[PDB]
Amino acid sequence: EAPQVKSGDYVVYRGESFEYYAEITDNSGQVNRVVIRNVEGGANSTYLSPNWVKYSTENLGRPGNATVQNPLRTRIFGEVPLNEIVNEKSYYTRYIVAWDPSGNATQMVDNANRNGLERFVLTVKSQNEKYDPAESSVTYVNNLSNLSTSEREAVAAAVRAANPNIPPTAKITVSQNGTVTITYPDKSTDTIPANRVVKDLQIS
Numbered sequence: 001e002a003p004q005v006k007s008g009d010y011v012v013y014r015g016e017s018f019e020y021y022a023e024i025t026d027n028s029g030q031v032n033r034v035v036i037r038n039v040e041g042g043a044n045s046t047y048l049s050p051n052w053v054k055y056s057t058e059n060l061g062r063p064g065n066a067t068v069q070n071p072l073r074t075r076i077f078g079e080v081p082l083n084e085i086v087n088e089k090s091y092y093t094r095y096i097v098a099w100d101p102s103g104n105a106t107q108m109v110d111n112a113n114r115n116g117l118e119r120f121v122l123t124v125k126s127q128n129e130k131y132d133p134a135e136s137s138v139t140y141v142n143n144l145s146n147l148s149t150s151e152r153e154a155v156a157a158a159v160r161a162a163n164p165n166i167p168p169t170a171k172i173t174v175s176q177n178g179t180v181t182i183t184y185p186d187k188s189t190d191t192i193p194a195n196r197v198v199k200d201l202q203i204s
């Protein structure tokens, strides 16, 4: 038997670092090598793209480094560039191959039913998708159809205060009717409708 791998659903986001760990076990208790690779290229290939996907495995080549009770772990990490293309097909299916002391290597099987095992999908999303802006602030304005500059600034400050985890260099803008736009570093956006963040007292 070859080393067995447990990975996951590895979603990553433009403009952001990522880090995941896969777990690897072997019936011998030992794994000597781990490669993460594209499917193409035959048994000797180590080619992996995109080039910003990195990985590392500590504690290779030691007895008992890959047991059920303490699996070997491989870090899969990197920084997603702002210039990545994002769409419904902007994923990359990759394979984790580990070798035991007898040279048995994890088999690459091209089937989505192996995803989360030795096969995994790296999905690149736009930066906005990492964030779920809180809509729990409320700013009272004079007239919801015509916010002043000071009122627009107050709405933006309230949204920022409720959203400390949004990237500090994301830009929060508010329109004359209170609509909020959060523009992330990769230039994707989230919107918040005005009536979730702004009210007036015009209605008796």
Ligand SMILES: CO[C@@H]1O[C@H](CO)[C@H](O)[C@@H](O[C@]2(C(=O)O)C[C@H](O)[C@@H](NC(=O)CO)[C@@H]([C@@H](O)[C@@H](O)CO)O2)[C@H]1O
Pocket (backbone or CB within 6 Å): 038, 039, 040, 049, 085, 089, 090, 091, 092, 093, 094, 110
């Ligand atoms: C032998 O054929 C390969 O089998 C694999 C499984 O073994 C994969 O199924 C398969 O397709 C995908 C994939 O999921 O990786 C579909 C993605 O939509 C697509 N990504 C983009 O286009 C990004 O914009 C594409 C590739 O361009 C990347 O992987 C580049 O290396 O590959 C196929 O080519």
Ligand code: NA
Pocket (backbone or CB within 6 Å): 001, 002, 003, 026, 027, 028, 100, 104
């Ligand atoms: Na084995």
Ligand code: NA
Pocket (backbone or CB within 6 Å): 128, 129, 130, 131, 132, 133, 190
């Ligand atoms: Na979002």
